[PDB]
């Protein structure tokens, strides 16, 4: 999980759910599109 | 006719026996002997002077079967068969070269009227005027 | 002796990819780790191997009880393989004359001169499991230089008359030149094989395809590595036709006034080209 202050909804099918409070964004086929902070 | 299994209309000029690589996949969909589609159409291909893309459609069946529908060549290539060059659309609304009147357009529409139930005479007349303006062609009668 | 090593899969994979007709003979006993027996099906005997020794036992027993039915359904396909090899075994597959170990190989050996079936054997080289088994088929399923069509020297240019010469010692001499290695002792060496005839030591052996004269020096045999001087070369040995002045790929090694062979079929093409450059300017001289 890459970390950066900006979670920008980037991939076309990008889920966003708030697990534990810190946002981590869920793609389907792209592992590269998953950030976690912010 | 059929449904979500397979329906693509793709065939180009039938002087070439071997399926051209981009056409290949529409024959590479439901397991054909590619010699069968070469031996089906050549009984009637000897009634033409080859050079224009003639279209067929493919449609499939359960076990190993298939079917296909023969029509006439479309008027879009018939616009640029008489006009000499096969590709004229470089600038649509800035080129004024080449005239054919409506009388040529209906006699290449009777061969549509004797083949197909859509692509009717009077409705296609503006689109056979519409494929003229995109190519940069003129029309007067 | 590995995981995923199914014997019956691979021999029945040849009929799908290679499209051939293999009928295997020596089958498998053991779940690849407690593997102890190789199932020869003609004599219907399993062979015990070494506990872990580099080669003690050869103990033959019967078919074990854990494979009493797979030996049944596979032996009946072995004895099929002579009824459709020769036409004469067709009427005793169905009539029920006994298909012994010795009778079936007399048809199948003639099925190696046309090569429609290959003979397969499972086992281990490194675990010493099968190597002592694999040798007896070579004298009975691989062909001999006197059982094959022998040296067939055609002519030169006059007429196409292919002539089967004799495989015995009663012919003009004949050999071929291949695997022509080098050495810093004598220079050029060969790994040549003589098909029939006997040569003495010291001969005016020519190379009759390229019109050159050579003389036959001190011939040396190997254990693939060690110099052993073979003086008298008998018909069928493989040795080193030493001292050839010029020699090409596959020309004859033959006395004059004799038949002459001339063949260089399928001359290859080395494709990838890299340019070597010297280090010093004294190096490019060498």
């Amino acid at each position: 999980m890459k970390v950066r202050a900006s979670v920008k909804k980037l991939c076309r099918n990008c889920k966003i759910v708030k697990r534990d409070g810190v946002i981590r964004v869920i793609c389907s086929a792209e592992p590269k599109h998953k950030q976690r902070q912010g | 006719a059929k449904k979500v299994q397979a329906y693509v209309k793709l065939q180009v000029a039938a002087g070439m026996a071997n399926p051209s690589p981009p056409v290949g996949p529409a024959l590479g969909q439901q397991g054909v002997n590619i010699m069968e589609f070469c031996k089906a159409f050549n009984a009637k291909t000897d009634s033409i002077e080859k050079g224009l893309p003639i279209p067929v459609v493919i449609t499939v069946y359960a076990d190993r079967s298939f079917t296909f529908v023969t029509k006439t060549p479309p008027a879009a290539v018939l616009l640029k068969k008489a006009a000499g060059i096969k590709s004229g659309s470089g600038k649509p609304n800035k080129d004024k070269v080449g005239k054919i009147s409506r009388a040529q357009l209906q006699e290449i529409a009777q061969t549509k009227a004797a083949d197909m139930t859509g692509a009717d005479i009077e409705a296609m007349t503006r689109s056979i005027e519409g494929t003229a303006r995109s190519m940069g062609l003129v029309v007067e009668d | 002796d590995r995981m995923g090593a199914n014997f019956l899969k691979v021999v029945n994979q040849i009929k799908t990819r290679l499209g051939a007709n293999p009928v295997p003979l020596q089958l498998a006993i053991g779940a690849e780790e407690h593997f102890t027996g190789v199932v020869d099906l003609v004599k219907m005997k399993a062979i015990n191997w070494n506990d872990a020794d580099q080669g003690v036992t050869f103990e033959y027993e019967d078919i074990p009880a854990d494979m009493v039915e797979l030996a049944n359904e596979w032996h009946q396909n072995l004895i099929e393989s002579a009824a459709e090899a020769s036409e004469e075994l067709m009427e005793k597959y169905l009539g029920g004359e006994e298909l012994t170990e010795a009778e079936i190989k007399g048809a199948l050996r003639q099925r190696v001169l046309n090569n429609e079936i290959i003979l397969v054997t499972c086992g281990s080289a490194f675990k010493n499991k099968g190597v002592q088994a694999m040798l007896d088929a070579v004298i009975d399923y691989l062909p001999s230089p006197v059982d094959v069509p022998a040296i067939n020297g055609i002519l030169d240019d006059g007429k196409d008359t292919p002539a089967e010469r004799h495989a015995s010692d009663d012919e003009p001499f004949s050999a071929l030149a291949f695997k022509i290695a080098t050495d810093p002792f004598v220079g050029n060496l060969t790994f040549f094989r003589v098909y029939s005839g006997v040569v003495n030591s010291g001969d005016t052996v020519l190379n009759s395809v390229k019109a050159a004269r050579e003389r036959f020096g001190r011939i040396v045999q190997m254990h693939a590595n060690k110099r052993e001087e073979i003086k008298e070369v008998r018909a069928g040995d493989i040795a080193a036709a030493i001292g050839l002045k010029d020699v090409t790929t596959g020309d004859t090694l033959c006395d004059p006034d004799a038949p002459i062979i001339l063949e260089r079929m399928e001359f290859p093409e080395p494709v990838i080209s890299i340019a070597v450059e010297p280090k010093t300017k004294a190096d490019q001289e060498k």
Binding site: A29 | - | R2, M3, G4
Partner: protein
Amino acid sequence: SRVAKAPVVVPAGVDVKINGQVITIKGKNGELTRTLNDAVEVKHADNTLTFGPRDGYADGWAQAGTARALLNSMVIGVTEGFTKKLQLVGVGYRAAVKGNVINLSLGFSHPVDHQLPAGITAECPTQTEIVLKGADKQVIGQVAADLRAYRRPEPYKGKGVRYADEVVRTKEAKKK
């Protein structure tokens, strides 16, 4: 809501034991009980079960929205069951069932044989296909996902242990 427009119909062959907050479902082949939270108002009304969110816990529309989906699965899981098949694609990798134990031919220097708990009747038609049967929807995944986590789907070959319906995304080497 959609969940409030979703009542569940218990059929004959599965008995409920409504001691208020604790429901123990007496079913076909097991006992699928869940001790829910106090954000629910449960009533097996006539035959079709009706539920309700308790006051104070107005977020119990979520907490019983779990429950409406929950007990529907329980009455159909204790009777019919789940086929949870896994596909073993591994070089020399086998699967064989004995009692309640599964072998794991997993490319190691030692065998892994792990015993599997109750609510599991496992089977193996071959070395690469493995049945799991169960009554709870949780237990039919939890014992399945542990095996898959021992050898995840490798996206350079397609290697690994993977589900029947799961479709991996294998890549290409592209350098050497």
